[PDB]
Curated annotation (Swiss-Prot):
Protein name: Non-secretory ribonuclease
Organism: Homo sapiens (Human)
Residues of the full protein shown: 28 to 161 of 161
Assembly, per entry: Interacts with and forms a tight 1:1 complex with RNH1. Dimerization of two such complexes may occur.
Keywords: Chemotaxis, Disulfide bond, Endonuclease, Glycoprotein, Hydrolase, Lyase, Lysosome, Nitration, Nuclease, Signal
Protein's UniProt keywords contain Ligase: no
Modified residue annotations for 3'-nitrotyrosine: 34
Gene name of this polypeptide: RNASE2
Highest classification ranks of the organism: Eukaryota, Metazoa, Chordata, Craniata, Vertebrata
GO cellular component: azurophil granule lumen; extracellular exosome; extracellular region; extracellular space
One GO MF term attached to the UniProt entry: ribonuclease A activity
One annotated GO biological process: RNA catabolic process
């Protein structure tokens, strides 16, 4: 789920593009502090936001996660990424959660939609709103 101050595009960027630290334990604190829980796993794509926006321009395809959605797009080429896996749950005090990190180069499939009319900058009419899968 996402905090109210974020549009879906901004949340996607916060969760899958802006890895604030090359260490998962540190990077995940941002996501976990916003969601109020330690997310079990999360993928950070080592690519730019502009690159993902352009992927939204690739042919539409059915989303692997939802057989009923046709707003997904395949990256075309592979990108470096880091997958974070929770290793230390820390029930309360989510800032004590620790993660493992797995580096890899994979293709990704993103779901894109029209920008949030009121909060997303007009610069990008179409934006990624969900990471559906990495291959």
């Amino acid at each position: 789920m996402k905090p109210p101050q974020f549009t879906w595009a901004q949340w996607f960027e916060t969760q899958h593009i802006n890895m604030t630290s090359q260490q998962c334990t540190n990077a995940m604190q941002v996501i976990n502090n916003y969601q109020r829980r330690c997310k079990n796993q999360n993928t950070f794509l080592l690519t730019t936001f502009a690159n993902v926006v352009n992927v939204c321009g690739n042919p539409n395809m059915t989303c692997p996660s939802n057989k009923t959605r046709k707003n997904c797009h395949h990256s075309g080429s592979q990108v470096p990424l880091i997958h974070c896996n929770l290793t230390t749950p820390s029930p309360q005090n989510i800032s004590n959660c620790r993660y493992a990190q797995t580096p890899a180069n994979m293709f990704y499939i993103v779901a894109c939609d029209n920008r949030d009319q009121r909060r997303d900058p007009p610069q990008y009419p179409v934006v990624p709103v969900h990471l559906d899968r990495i291959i």
